[PDB]
Design a protein around this ligand. Structure first.
Ligand SMILES: Nc1ncnc2c1ncn2[C@@H]1O[C@H](COP(=O)(O)OP(=O)(O)O)[C@@H](O)[C@H]1O
Lengths: 191, 81, 31, 375, 130, 130
């Protein structure tokens, strides 16, 4: 399944939260490494880029078939600022549109552990817009679940519409291991 | 413990790839230098050596004198006059 | 593990040597 | 462990705070290690710690077992919060030094710690060392990408140091920079009403500060307009538009302030200089020939020292030109520009209107006359 | 506030241009917009990773008649001595148009048909004054 | 260092020190000591009457020395101490030796030699014989 994925990564201060041993930062690093490797092993023609969600969004790596560069550029990501989920997602959509290979499915997996402070109306509008441009926004929730779970359900339900298994939500309030939670998840299971 | 395995797994998986990239595009750079150093050189002297980096006032065996602001591929091994 | 500080030293050395190699390489290309 | 034990004990043995201990300690057990970084501030700023060594106990126990991973800047901020209610300066210097040693990665945290220790040296005296640390932290503060509350704290420190050393001009500059860095509205109205007054005094007595403009428009001065000190704003406005008559009128008060009363002569000289500057600025280049009688009718002096006043102006660099005292007039060919008012800019707009009209008329004349040879 | 400047493409092109010519390092960026945008500061922040003194140059494709087509800006963020809140904004940089000799030859050849005399003829001098 | 193609002066360079420098007797420095001349003390004392010229200039002012003399003849048998005789005295003087050999081409060479020298000090032009 020829795939182009964008891994959005929160690097807000709340990643200083240390529920996931040893730290949320190292946990998300391990999870992104695992998911990128899983995407690459299946049909290596797939390409993966990476986005940093900080005070202002950034794209650390565009769609590439390699994973070591993405790991290396993420390793130096430190917790700073606050998350801007909407801008991060829009940047991800722009990167998907600009991807060199037009024969790929459009996926965006977002490590979004944070309280998403955005307006619900524009939120649902963005979700529907992405559904229109045929995007699959998988969302990994680890953090303020009590706050963002309903909004993430809105994300995924609006994206799916009817029978739309493209977009998925995986929430992990418990913190045994983020990497293991991700590997034993529906998103990576189908690959 | 876990920190040891972390620094022996993730640090390794990143740093080894970094060194691999460096040592591959060093191969590319060295190959380009080797292609640009095509054999038919013009045997010449280093009559005078100056500094400003270093320079040269080489005396080409075609009874000619050429100042070089950049010495070039040579190792700058003191290149005595 | 025996390899922790040994690998740290080996890295440091290899990185500095290769960075000097690239200083000279790019200097030669610009020359 | 000892930290959980203290947490459970002060769950009810702590000041006020019925269940915030419950939430703080359940988060600490959750091992977030940062979510309570905000609660610590929000509670320590409460009017509960004023002279309590319990805050130091809290710090020691759980901040020592907690500092291994915390926002370095927030950690240093809470460090200063604890230090405030500690009255052992000799040990406070060492405490702050160990906090520095703990926090090395965060350059900004180092900045703020250096500022705090310099502030403590200032509070105990030690002018030479506080100046040395001010210079050090300044030169290694002008190395970061942008501005921040750390710059705010440094500029406040520098303002305080220059106030205590008496360098009014440098104090004025640094305090203005500090007010620029920090948000005006976040400060208490009392803090404003005081900082604005101190800036007014520094500008009023500063060597080389003639630009009292920019301050009547700085919003920090929105604290004396209706207060019982709008007088100060009035006086500063008088200097901005040098009105030695109005300043003598306002003499009814500033004789009360000992510093200004002592430095009357400096005030009079500075206002005379500003009056001459503003007169020259008002006069157009057509008839910028100021007269001795004019300067006499201006800031009150007989015509035997307008010469010396103009000499002082030229030497300081306020204006440029010459003084023909044979004909008893002064030629001004420059003025040091300053900050202006909306009406002073409307006048400039009118003058431009005229200039544009003249240029357009001459353009049309030349174009029509030479129409047959224009390429 | 959402844009997708391609850093990977930037670095690849910069590397190939280094290979072709070496005494040309990334010195800034340009955008053909008559006016700035809120994204200009962010993109200059992005470019400052490739150049410390990164300079924006707005090159207006729409041809004017009084001034040069290039406006230069340098991003300076400093505590305003004014005492006002400080925001990371641009500052104008003096700009000029100059040419290599190998570019002067091409420019003159391309303009040979509509060139003016490189001498002051009275009509042209009066026109220049106008 | 002219440009190769357009022949434009790109940078000035230090003068070349060709082998025709030292062989031209252009050694400025070089002293050993005063005690090596075992005898010859009277001649040393006499030659130290040329030290007045530099250390002061009362030759100007009341009197005139027509640019006071430039040394004495050092009349010597086949060879006793000539070179070292001058060496020790000038080492005391702190001056430096521009020794010269006189053993129209050679005339012009020596002329240019001292023309380069004097711009900089004992000159020791010798070898008049033959
Ligand atoms: N008074 C002296 N004391 C010690 N050595 C002497 C004395 N006179 C001559 N010599 C030796 O003889 C040599 C004479 O050299 P020089 O003076 O250059 O030639 P000439 O004596 O023919 O003028 C010197 O190198 C020195 O070693």
């Amino acid at each position: 399944v020829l795939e182009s994925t964008m891994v959005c990564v929160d690097n807000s201060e709340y990643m200083r939260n240390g529920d996931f041993l040893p730290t949320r930062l190292q946990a998300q690093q391990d999870a992104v490494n695992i998911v990128c490797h899983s995407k690459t092993r299946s049909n290596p023609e797939n390409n993966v880029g990476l986005i940093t969600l900080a005070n202002d969004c950034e794209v650390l790596t565009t769609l590439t078939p390699d994973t070591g560069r993405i790991l290396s550029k993420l390793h130096t990501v430190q917790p700073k600022g606050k998350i801007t989920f909407c801008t991060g997602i829009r940047v991800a959509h722009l990167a998907l549109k600009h991807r060199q290979g037009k024969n790929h499915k459009m996926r965006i997996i977002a490590f979004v552990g944070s309280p998403v402070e955005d307006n619900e109306k524009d939120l649902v509008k963005l979700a529907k817009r992405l559904k229109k441009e045929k995007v699959n926004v998988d969302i990994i929730n680890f953090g303020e679940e009590e706050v963002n779970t309903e909004k993430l359900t809105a994300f995924v339900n609006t994206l799916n519409g009817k029978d739309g298994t493209g977009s998925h939500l995986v929430t992990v309030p418990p913190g045994p291991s983020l990497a293991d939670a991700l590997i034993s998840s529906p998103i990576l299971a189908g690959e | 413990l876990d920190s040891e395995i972390k620094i022996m797994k993730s640090e390794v998986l990143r740093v080894t790839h970094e060194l691999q990239a460096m040592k591959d595009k060093i191969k590319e750079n060295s190959e380009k230098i080797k292609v640009n150093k095509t054999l038919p050189y013009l045997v010449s002297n280093v009559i005078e050596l100056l500094d400003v980096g270093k320079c040269a006032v080489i005396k080409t065996s075609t009874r000619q004198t050429y100042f070089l602001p950049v010495i070039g591929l040579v190792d700058a091994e003191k290149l005595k006059p | 593990h025996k390899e922790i500080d040994g690998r740290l030293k080996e890295l440091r050395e290899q990185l500095k040597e290769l960075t000097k190699q690239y200083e000279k390489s790019e200097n030669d290309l610009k020359a | 462990k000892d930290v959980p034990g203290f947490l459970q004990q002060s769950q009810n043995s702590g000041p006020g705070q019925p269940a915030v201990w419950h939430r703080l300690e359940e988060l600490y057990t959750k091992k977030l290690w940062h979510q309570l970084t905000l609660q610590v501030l929000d509670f320590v700023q409460d009017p509960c710690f004023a002279q309590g060594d319990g805050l130091i106990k809290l710090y020691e126990n759980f901040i020592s077992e907690f500092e291994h991973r915390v926002n370095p800047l927030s950690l240093v901020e809470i460090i200063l919060h604890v230090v405030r209610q500690m009255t052992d300066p000799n040990v406070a210097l060492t405490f702050l030094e160990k906090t520095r040693e703990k926090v090395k990665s965060s350059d900004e945290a180092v900045i703020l710690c250096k500022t705090a220790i310099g502030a403590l040296k200032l509070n105990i005296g030690d002018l030479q060392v506080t100046k040395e640390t001010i210079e050090d932290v300044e030169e290694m503060l002008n190395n970061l990408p942008g501005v921040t509350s750390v710059h705010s704290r440094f500029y406040d420190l520098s303002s305080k140091y220059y106030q205590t050393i008496g360098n009014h001009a440098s104090y004025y500059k640094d305090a203005l920079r500090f007010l620029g860095c920090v948000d005006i509205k976040d400060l208490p109205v009392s803090e404003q009403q005081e900082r604005a007054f101190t800036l007014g005094l520094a500008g009023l007595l500063g060597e080389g500060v003639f630009n009292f403009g920019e301050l009547l428009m700085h919003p920090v001065l929105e604290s004396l307009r209706n207060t019982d000190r709008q007088w100060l704003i009035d006086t500063l406005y008088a200097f901005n538009s040098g009105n030695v008559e109005r300043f003598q009128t306002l003499k009814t008060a500033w004789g009360q302030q000992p510093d200004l009363a002592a430095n009357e002569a400096q005030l009079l000289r500075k206002i005379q200089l500003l009056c001459l500057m503003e007169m020259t600025f008002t006069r157009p280049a057509n008839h910028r020939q100021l007269t001795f009688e004019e300067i006499a009718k201006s800031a009150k002096i007989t015509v035997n020292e307008v010469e010396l006043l103009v000499m002082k102006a030229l030497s300081v660099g306020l204006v440029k030109g010459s003084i023909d005292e044979v004909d008893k007039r002064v030629h001004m060919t420059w003025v040091q520009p300053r900050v202006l008012d909306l009406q002073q800019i409307k006048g400039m707009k009118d003058r431009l209107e005229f200039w544009c009209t003249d240029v357009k008329s001459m353009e049309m004349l030349v174009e029509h006359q030479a129409h047959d040879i224009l390429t | 506030s959402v844009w997708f400047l391609d850093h990977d493409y930037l670095e690849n092109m910069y590397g190939m241009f280094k290979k072709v010519n070496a005494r040309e390092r990334i010195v800034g960026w340009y955008h053909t917009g008559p006016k700035l945008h809120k994204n200009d500061i962010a993109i200059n922040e992005l470019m400052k990773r490739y150049c410390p003194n990164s300079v924006l140059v707005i090159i207006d494709v729409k041809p004017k008649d009084l001034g040069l087509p290039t406006e230069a800006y340098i991003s300076v963020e400093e505590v305003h001595d004014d005492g006002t809140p400080t925001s990371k904004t641009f500052e104008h940089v003096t700009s000029e148009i100059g040419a290599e000799e190998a570019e002067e030859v091409g420019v003159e050849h391309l303009l040979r048909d509509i060139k003016d005399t490189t001498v002051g003829t009275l009509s042209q001098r009066i026109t220049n004054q106008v | 260092a002219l440009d190769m193609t357009t022949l434009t002066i790109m940078r000035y360079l230090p003068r070349e020190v060709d082998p025709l420098v030292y062989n031209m007797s252009h050694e400025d420095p070089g002293n050993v000591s005063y005690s090596e001349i075992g005898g010859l003390s009277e001649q040393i004392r006499e030659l130290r009457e040329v030290i007045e010229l530099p250390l002061t200039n009362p030759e100007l002012f009341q009197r005139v020395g027509i640019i006071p003399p430039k040394g004495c003849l050092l009349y010597g048998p086949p060879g006793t101490g000539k070179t070292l005789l001058a060496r020790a005295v000038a080492s005391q003087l702190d001056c430096n030796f521009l020794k010269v050999v006189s053993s129209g081409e050679s005339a012009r060479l020596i002329r240019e030699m001292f023309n380069y020298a004097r711009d900089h000090c004992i000159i020791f032009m010798d070898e008049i014989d033959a």
